[PDB]
Each structure stands twice: as structure tokens, then as C-alpha cells.
Amino acid sequence: ESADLRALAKHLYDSYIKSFPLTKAKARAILTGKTTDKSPFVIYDMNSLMMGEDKIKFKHITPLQEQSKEVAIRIFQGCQFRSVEAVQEITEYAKSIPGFVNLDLNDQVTLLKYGVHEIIYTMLASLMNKDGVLISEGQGFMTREFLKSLRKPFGDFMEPKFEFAVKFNALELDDSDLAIFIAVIILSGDRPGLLNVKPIEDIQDNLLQALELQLKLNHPESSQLFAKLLQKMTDLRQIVTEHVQLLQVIKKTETDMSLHPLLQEIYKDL
Template sequence: MKEELHPKSPSADEQLSGTAGQQHTVHNVDCKICGDKASGFHYGVHACEGCKGFFRRTLRMRLQYEHCDRNCKIQKKNRNKCQYCRFNKCLSLGMSHNAIRFGRMPEAERRRLVHVTTPDSDSLVSDLVALSQRIHSSYMSTFTMTKTRARDILTGRSNISPFVIYDMETLWQAEKGTVWDQLLTQNPPGTEIGVHVFYRCQCTSVETVRALTDFAKSIPGFSTIYLNDQVTLLKYGVHEAIFCMLASLMNKDGLLVAGGRGFVTREFLRSLRLPFCHIMEPKFNFASKFNALELNDSDLALFVAAIILCGDRPGLMNPSQVEDIQERILSALRRHLQTSHPDAPFLFPKLLHKMADLRQLVTEHAELVQSIKRTESSASLHPLLQEIYRDMY
């Protein structure tokens, strides 16, 4: 991957010292839960990394999911849609719950699961609080357009009055320096308007990818991961994180751009010709539901960190190491939400569900981008984004 996505690599000694252990793989065996390729015999059944991590996270964090009586069919393509039915299927197929059925489980894993049933110690809580504060501080110093700042602008509480872009004329005015610092040489640009909006979306994405790479480096534990795994986590995680943070810049009428200096109306984006009119509309639909959760910047910092450190990304050399780091972040997020949202007991599992929604949103976005590349000869793709999308889905 290009230089922007290459965090600092651990030393050869670190990589060879066992920081990332070996992953045992079971060949030609399907996961009993979702049908994906099983990675081993986990908690009593053959399971994939995704279902293993889901079950372990449910146990460790004592999660309770909203009831569902539809008996949803759990498959690889939809396994993240209904957490209640997925967990019930884990139990019905023999994965242990309260009385852990250890079977062939390694001793280290057995000790870790026994530890789940013990109360959280004061020192552990203190460590999670410190982790939350460290990630929040890094998030606020890395990203200038925070949710707090964006909501102040969108609700008129800020002294910033964004320039409204609602048609072709106002877009070209914005390009003349009213909104964007990067001035175009042509006036108006020689490209068709839909292609130009696609270009602007890419500019913003590239800037955010670079910021997310810096943020990832600051997450405790990230620098200990294999360099190849760091790149894989960023490749698959940056767009999920981008669309999560993008929701903070949106309301039902449009979105802020250029650090709040501009506001592009939703109707203008809808008015673009096919396929460009489909670029942003799914993001607005996601944002309306995501913003209803009323997360603050400290919540979002931990959520974005958890998105990046996702242990079921394809091609990871040591997924269990990534899972361990993510679960610590998720534990910190769960504790933090209990404090910041005491009246929303289901907020944490809802956020885990939003991770699945973001993954689907990115899949659809990647398909649209690849379609635009094939059908629109004048719509080029930034090299960094090309590298991210290559072999992604």
C-alpha cells in the first residue's frame, strides 16, 4: 500500500519474539454458525474468526441483545444483522455459556474465560478509564472537525456561517475560493458536474484516510501488530470510520464540507445524474439513524478505534492479537457508555450492530466506485483510494 497507509513497523525482534502468535487453521471445514470457513475448534464447535469473536465478546462483556422471535437464518452474508438470533444459534449448536464446555480448548483460553465470571477489579476499571481518556485525547487532537464543533455550526450556535452550495453556480463560486483552499485552474472546471462532485468526495476521503492513519498509530497496542496487519486493518477500516464520522457533519438537509466553511444541500446531491446521485444518499440514510443515538466525541473516539481494530478482517496474519486489543477498547467503550448514557442500557449492543451496518455501507460504496470507474471514462480514482479498493470485496 502507498506510503500514507504505512504506519511505523515493529522491529524484526518484536515480530519474531512472539508478539503475534501463530494461528491454527482447520482446512475445508465450515463454521457451524454461519457457514464461513472455520478457523478452528472454538468453545466446543468449529467456528470462523467472526463467530468466535462474537461469542467471546458476548461472554466477556455479558451482553444482552434486544429480543427477536423471528428465528433469523444466520449466514455469512447476514450474520451481523441479528445478534440475538446469532447468539442463540451459537448456544443451540453447543457453544458454552455459563458452564463453559472447555473440551479441546487451550489452557490459556480456558483461564481467560474463567476470568470472565469474576467481577471487574478497581484496577481494571481504572485502566479502562485511562484508555478511554487517552484515545479521546488523541481523537480530539487529530480531527479538527469534531462532532461538537459540527453540531454548533449546523444549529447556529457558532459564529461560522457556511456558504451554501445548492446548484452548479454556487458550486463554482465555492471553487473560486469561497469554500475550498485548493483552487482549480479552470473556471468553471472542464469536467461534468457529477464527475467533479466525485472528485471532491475523493479529496475529502484522502485527507481523512491520512488523519485516520495518524489516529490509528496512537491507539495503544496498534504499533505492536505486524506491519502487514496494520495495513490490512487500515485498508478495510478507514471507510467504515469515515462514514461513521461523516454522520456528525450531516443533518436531514445536507452536510458540512471544508472544515465547516461550506454546506452542500442534499437536494443538490440528489439532482446529479446517475450514478453520481447515489454516492451520498445512502450515507444520509445511515446518518439519520446513527445520529439518533446521540453519541458525543468521547463515545465516537472509542467507537472509531474499535472499528479500526477489527479482528475478522480478511488476510490478517494474527487475528487473535487484534481481537484482544479490540476487546479491551470495547470494554472501555461499554464502561464509558454506562457513565455517559446511563439511561440507554442497549446503546452498546446497538453500536455493535452499527458496525455491521457500516460494513454493508462500505461494501455498497466500493461496488458503486468500481462501477463508476468502469462506466465513466472521465472519472479517475485517486491512487491511494485505488490501493484501498483493490481486492477489497
């Protein structure tokens, strides 16, 4: 019954709203300078970065950065905190997925270890547009150009994600769609190490069904959106990979720079 599938969509959509403070709807509402209720402060250079500390909630350094944690390291450390944040959010979204907490405890850890980054870059797209990305729950907006002008290594950490976002956002999905897609990503089953795969695949087939109906119902005039979204999973993979291999480089040119335990745990080479 497609009725049980619509119900599962509803359930997932509901938990998505409850687990993630900044949805795509709010984000787009902020990105389109129409809704002038509360606009973001823009960062496109050092000075504005300086001013941003005063206009937004920046606990980082405001003045000079060269001889005191340069701008690049600062932005990276702050971007790191938000990442560990997204995990607790995603980790909380996950438990709401029917059957996920009933699975083997170990596999739960593996599904989260391998799905967290893919989900972070999927949701990160909701906060991007060809020109930049929202920061601090939408109070700010950092320029794609500014981020790309950072020190040699930190300069291209974000470029491949903007490239994903522009094409992924062309699909025009909304939160109710993203909620089912995020659930499909977690319940993979082809993750390295899973002890029991069948119980995970039975759940994902279920999710895949819900996503299929949801897309045809919500995007009737979009031929093959279902297939087109799934192929986006290949793009997410490559992003995680380049990110990881970029970290190994930094980890060697910035012996004084520290990574967070959680994130450091999740990451694994090869």
C-alpha cells in the same frame, strides 16, 4: 479495574482531538444556526456552487462544467481528495492505539485497509443532518437534494450515507464516545488476511471494555446503547459495499476519470 478503562478512554479521546480537525462538537456547533460567529455558505444549486468557489477555498472550476469536467466529476474529485486526507488522519489516530504499532506490520496494513472506510462513514455522520453535509472544514454546507440531483450515476453516491447518518446520529454520541468506537472498528480481527488474530482480539476486547463503561457512564439513561452501537457496524458494512460496487460502474462509464492510488489500493472486490 474500571480505573484503567477510564484512563484508556481519556487517552483515546485525547488522540482523537489531536488527529481530527473537525470534531462532532464543532460540526454540530456549525449546523445549529445558533452560533452565528461563523456560518457556512450553502450550496443547493449550480449558481451557489459557482458562488461557493469565491466564498470558500475551491481550487476546482468555478464557471461552466459541461464541456470541461462536469459538476458531478468535480465534486467527486474533490470528495476524493478529502478521503485520502481522512486516511492519513485515521492512520495517525491508529498509531496512538495501545499495542497497534507493536502488531505484525502486515496486519497493521490489513486493519487499516479494511477499517478506513467504515471509520470515514462513521465520522462523516458527525457532519450531516437530514438536509445536507458540511464541506471544507465546515466553511460550506452542501444540500442533500443538490447532491442527489447530480448525473444519473453520481446522483446516488451519497444518498445511502445520509440514510446512515440520520439513524446513527439518533444515538446522540459525542466525540469521547466516537473515539473509542473508532478504535474498536480498527482492531477487528475478522479482517480477511490477518496473520495473527489473538493479539488483535486481546486489544479489541480491551477497547470493547472501555467503550462499555464509557457509554454507561456517559449515557446512564440509555438502555442497551452499547449493543445498539455495535449493531451499527452492520450498517457500515453495507455502505462500504454499495460504494465499492458503484465505483466499478463509474470506472467503466468514465474511462477518463481517475481514482487515487491509495484508495484504489484499499478497495478489493468480493
